[PDB]
């Protein structure tokens, strides 16, 4: 079922990629924490979906964001060799549910979902699934509700002590082709007790027929071990954050807890 159809830019992520570091409720407080966060005012790699779906490094954790209207980006593949030799993690959002599996998958040279559209540009139907040819020795399976003006979706992927932890946020965006300037904290989505080695990942697109895609783009950044001062409002929501390693002004604010 594999189709051998073959032939970046950077943006400024001002104050984004911050997530609730734990599950402890806090309010009306400035709290200092140390964890893996996206550095402020960093160079985030910008890809377009003609589509770009290369294999990217995972490093110590991945900040992933997408802007789209037609729901082209459906999921991700995480692993090492990304073939039948090792276990790998497949996260895909289908028409009704999100399917998360860990198996010895044999992925296609260029994996994707094969869909077609109605005469209108809102409805769609599946034709086939062209991501892998096999899925042997499955160890983990989880099914839940889908992860899903353009739609902005942000995810943070961490892998600590065997747990693949996903944080997320979904907001509307009124920009044409870039990330918003402002602050928004990501919330815990799911904790997956998997126990596998991840060094690389790939983005899965829904393509249609040879095969093409509509207008969409996504951004990839990386997390670093940095100190942040998080501002919790009266309702316990983080409304601001200071990157203590950004500049001398932030250092002063973090030192004085203000």
């Amino acid at each position, epitope marked *: 079922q594999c189709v051998n159809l073959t032939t970046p830019a950077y943006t400024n992520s001002f104050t984004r990629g911050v997530y609730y570091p734990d599950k402890v409720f806090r309010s009306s407080v400035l709290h200092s924490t140390q964890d893996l966060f996206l550095p402020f005012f960093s160079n985030v790699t910008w890809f377009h979906a003609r589509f770009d779906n290369p294999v990217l490094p995972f490093n110590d954790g991945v900040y992933f964001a997408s802007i789209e209207k037609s*729901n082209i980006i459906r999921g991700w593949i995480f692993g090492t060799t990304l073939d039948s030799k090792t276990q790998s993690l497949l996260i895909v959002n*289908n*028409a*009704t*549910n999100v399917v998360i599996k860990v198996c010895e998958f044999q992925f296609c040279n260029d994996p994707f979902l094969d869909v077609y559209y*109605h*005469k*209108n540009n*809102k*409805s*769609w*139907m*599946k034709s086939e699934f062209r991501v892998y040819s096999s899925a042997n020795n499955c160890t983990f399976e989880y099914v839940s509700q889908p992860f899903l003006f353009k739609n902005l979706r942000e995810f943070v992927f961490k892998n600590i002590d065997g747990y693949f932890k996903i944080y997320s946020k979904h907001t509307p965006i009124n920009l044409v082709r870039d990330l918003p300037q402002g602050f928004s904290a990501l919330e815990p989505l799911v904790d997956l007790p998997i126990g596998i080695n991840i060094t690389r990942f790939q983005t899965l697109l829904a393509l249609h027929r040879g095969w093409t895609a509509g207008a969409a783009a996504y951004y990839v950044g990386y997390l670093q071990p940095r100190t942040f001062l998080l501002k919790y409002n009266e309702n316990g929501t983080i409304t601001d954050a200071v990157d203590c390693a950004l500049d001398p002004l932030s250092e002063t604010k973090c030192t004085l807890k203000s």
Partner: antibody, heavy 125, light 105 residues
Framework: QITLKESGPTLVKPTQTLTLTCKLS??????????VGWIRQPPGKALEWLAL???????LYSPSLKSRLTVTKDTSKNQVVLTMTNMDPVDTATYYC?????????????????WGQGTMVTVSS | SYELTQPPSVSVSPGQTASITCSGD??????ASWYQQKPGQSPILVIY???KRPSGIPERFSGSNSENTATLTISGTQTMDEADYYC?????????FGGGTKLTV
């Protein structure tokens, strides 16, 4: 394979309520993308669509008959039940249930691939 | 319901091509489908989404949909193709079947 089986009363009186049950196999009513519709065909006449139910309990009805039609599904028995009230002699027809192909995103009905055998219901005194 | 019109009947000689039309208001915007019903039997899907066949349907059956008119064509019509043919179209979840065309051979 996929199959559907209609059952229920084959005779009702005027002003009585008819209940028809569609017993299905090969798929579950709780499975995403699944829908089951009801269609009737009076002797010598064309098919008329009545209603269909989606796996997510969303429902579609024919505007001209909506006021007399209720559709529910049994999530344990894999059965779809159609209730049609206040029937008149003119409502005599063969009733069918069938599988519905469904479009996603903006959810729409497409076509009926697998049909049941159908059951004949007469309305008379 | 959705308004949808068919010819009352079509009559061809064996070996000829049968053509059954189906006229609506918005068939150029939505998808049409066709069913074949034999006497005493439930209808069988022959064409869906304008021109796609289900597995098991003979290559004799084809069709199209343009200018708000849909058609079903039977090439090399056989005497075993005698049946009542119906067209269907959905207008934004509003169903509608045509009157049905009796095809004789």
């Amino acid at each position: 394979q996929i199959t559907l089986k209609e059952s229920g009363p084959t005779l009702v009186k005027p002003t009585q309520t008819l209940t028809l049950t569609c017993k299905l196999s090969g798929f579950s009513v709780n499975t995403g993308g699944v829908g089951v519709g009801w269609i009737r065909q009076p002797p010598g006449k064309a098919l008329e669509w009545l209603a269909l139910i989606y796996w997510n309990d969303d429902k579609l009805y024919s505007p001209s008959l909506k006021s007399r039609l209720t559709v529910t599904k049994d999530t344990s028995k894999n059965q779809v039940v159609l209730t049609m009230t206040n029937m008149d002699p003119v409502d005599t027809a063969t009733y069918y249930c069938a599988h519905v192909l469904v479009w996603f995103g903006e959810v729409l009905p497409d076509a009926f691939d697998v049909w049941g055998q159908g059951t004949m219901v007469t309305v008379s005194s | 319901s959705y308004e949808l019109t068919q010819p009352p009947s079509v009559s061809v000689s064996p070996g000829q091509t049968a053509s059954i039309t189906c006229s609506g208001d918005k068939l150029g915007e939505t998808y049409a489908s066709w069913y074949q019903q034999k006497p005493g039997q439930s209808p069988i899907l022959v064409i869906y989404q304008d021109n796609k066949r289900p597995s098991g349907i003979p290559e004799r059956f084809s069709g199209s949909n343009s200018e708000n008119t849909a058609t079903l064509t039977i090439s090399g019509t056989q005497t075993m193709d005698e049946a009542d043919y119906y067209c269907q179209a959905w207008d934004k979840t509003i169903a509608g079947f045509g009157g049905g065309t009796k095809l004789t051979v």
